Amino acid sequence: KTVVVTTILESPYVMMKKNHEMLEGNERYEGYCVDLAAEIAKHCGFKYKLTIVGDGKYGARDADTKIWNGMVGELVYGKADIAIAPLTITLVREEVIDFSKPFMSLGISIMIKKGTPIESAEDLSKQTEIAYGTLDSGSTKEFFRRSKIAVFDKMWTYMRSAEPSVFVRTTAEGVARVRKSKGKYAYLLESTMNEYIEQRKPCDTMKVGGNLDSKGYGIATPKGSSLRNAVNLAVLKLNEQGLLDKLKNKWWYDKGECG
């Protein structure tokens, strides 16, 4: 039967094509995870329907209702058969679904406006001219809250107390604050998105320094899924064939706007 694929509208993983209103089904979409889904489906021998997650979320368990939201919720409640998306591999998610081996690495990184005299996390931690922050309710904030590393502890102590708030509700808001004329703000976010935005007009931001942690994105299936093993082996095959590296280069660089 037709496999229901849950995914999320996040660039460049899944984007609406030019002329999407004239198109139907899977042809409406393009991007890294659209290309990845087509290859996974070929290698595993299934036909599929791409669906955009109903709530636009990745997946977390509400502490009060005990209900999972996002793509993880769609898998655990039987709304979708597989999630093919930049879904971070985490312990609480692996307790309720199965992840493939990762298809992409990422880590916390620093975004500056070009010109800002900052090249690293240590640089941020040792000055006060440039403000810095992150999403108000996510994994980057939690990384800093829990860290026992001196540099990151110093950064957290600053961020938690800073006035006005250095936290933002969205990346659109965070990047707008980086870009504001004489804004003197740096934004902490996933390296993959920082690198992506660095390749988009107006070409005024950059990723600086090394990543602060190491994580991976994986494909997720529900417990006991007949697809688990084949999907896992397919991710490894695509890596060994060089296809994952080719797709990253395609969507970040070949289609990049900053030279």
Ligand X SMILES: CC(C)(C)c1ccc(C2=CC=CN3CCS(=O)(=O)N=C23)cc1
Q: What residues line the site for Zn ion (CB under 5 A)?
A: 39, 62, 64, 136, 167
Determine whether the annotation assigns residue 192 to a binding site. Answer: no
Angle at 118 between CA 112 and CA 119, to 5 degrees: 95
Sort residue 34 into left (φ over 0), alpha (ψ -120 to 50) or beta: alpha
Query: Does residue 255 belong to the site contacting its own copies (CB under 8 A)?
Result: no
Query: Does residue 110 belong to the site contacting ligand ZK1 (CB under 6 A)?
Result: no
Rounded to whole angstroms, the Cα distance separating 9 from 32 reads 11
* 58 binding partner (options ligand X, ligand ZK1, its own copies, none; Cβ < 5 to 8 Å by kind): ligand ZK1
* 56 binding partner (options Zn ion, its own copies, ligand X, none; Cβ < 5 to 8 Å by kind): its own copies
Positive or negative CA dihedral for 97, 98, 104, 110? positive
Determine whether the annotation assigns residue 169 to a binding site. Answer: no
Q: Which long-range contacts (CB under 8 A, 24 or more apart) does 154-159 make?
A: 154/125, 155/121, 155/124, 155/125, 158/125, 158/132, 159/132, 159/133, 159/134
Query: Does residue 180 belong to the site contacting its own copies (CB under 8 A)?
Result: yes
Query: Judged by CB under 6 A, which of 50, 193, 212, 227 binds ligand ZK1?
Result: 193
Rounded to whole angstroms, the Cα distance separating 35 from 14 reads 9
Site for its own copies in 40-99 (CB under 8 A): 54-56, 69
95 or 240, CB closer to ligand ZK1?
Answer: 95
Is 202 in a helix, a strand, or coil? Answer: coil
* 170 binding partner (options its own copies, ligand X, Zn ion, none; Cβ < 5 to 8 Å by kind): its own copies
As a whole number of Å, the end-to-end CA separation of the chain is: 44
Query: Does residue 210 belong to the site contacting its own copies (CB under 8 A)?
Result: no
Helix 228-240 to helix 32-44 angle (10° resolution) is: 120
Neighbours of 74 (CB within 10 A): 25
For the window 74-93, what string marks contact with ligand ZK1 as x by the rule CB under 6 A? ------------xxx-----
Determine whether the annotation assigns residue 88 to a binding site. Answer: yes
Query: Judged by CB under 8 A, which of 2, 22, 91, 172 binds its own copies?
Result: 172
122 or 136, CB closer to Zn ion?
Answer: 136
Task: Point out the annotated binding site for L-glutamate.
Answer: 86, 88, 93, 139-140, 190
